[model samples]
Target: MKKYVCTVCGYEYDPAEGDPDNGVKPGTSFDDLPADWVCPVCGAPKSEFEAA
Candidate 1:
């Protein structure tokens, strides 16, 4: 399993699979961001994501 972390708030979007926001349910790609990708809490750009 891959873990995606937020760059702004140090929030980890672990178990990143099943992210309904991006339609990447049950799985996601660190290289591929959702079409409507946007940080809900910080609103950081998808480019800001880093490995946890």
Candidate 2:
């Protein structure tokens, strides 16, 4: 699966290891993330992420 990188904070969002701390569980792809989900590091919107 593709990875998504946050442009604002350089946080890499991995589908293999979803942001569990933010209620996202493992195996959750970037596209599958909730619409309200924001970057946990810098609070940037999903629009700030780029496919990597």
Candidate 3:
């Protein structure tokens, strides 16, 4: 799966290593992320992310 990077903070969202800090488990795709999911590092909204 493709990765998405946070534009505001350069945080890389890896589907293979979902953000446990945000309750996101491994294998979770970017598209499957909850609407409230934000960049765990900078708190940027999903909209602030782009394909990496």
lDDT of each: 0.66, 0.93, 0.92
Give one digit per residue, the lDDT tens place, for model 2 in 1-52. 6899999999999999998988999999999999999999899999989999
lDDT of 3 by residue, 1-52 (tens): 8999999999999999998878889999999999999888888999989999
Candidate 2, after superposition: displacement of residue 48 in Å?
Answer: 0.9
lDDT of 1 by residue, 1-52 (tens): 6777778977566554546665656656656656567665688876787876
Each prediction's total of clashing residue pairs, residues at least 3 apart in sequence or on different chains, is 1, 0, 0
TM-score for model 1? 0.61
Candidate 1 regions with alpha-carbon error over 4 angstroms: none
- TM-score-superior candidate, 1 or 3: 3
RMSD of 1: 2.3
What's model 3's lDDT at 49? Answer: 95
Candidate with maximal TM-score: 3
TM-score of 2: 0.92
Off by over 4 Å in 3: none
Q: How close is candidate 3 to the true structure, as a TM-score?
A: 0.93
TM-score per prediction, in order, is 0.61, 0.92, 0.93
Residue 28 in model 1: shift from native, Å?
1.9
Better candidate by lDDT, 1 or 2 = 2
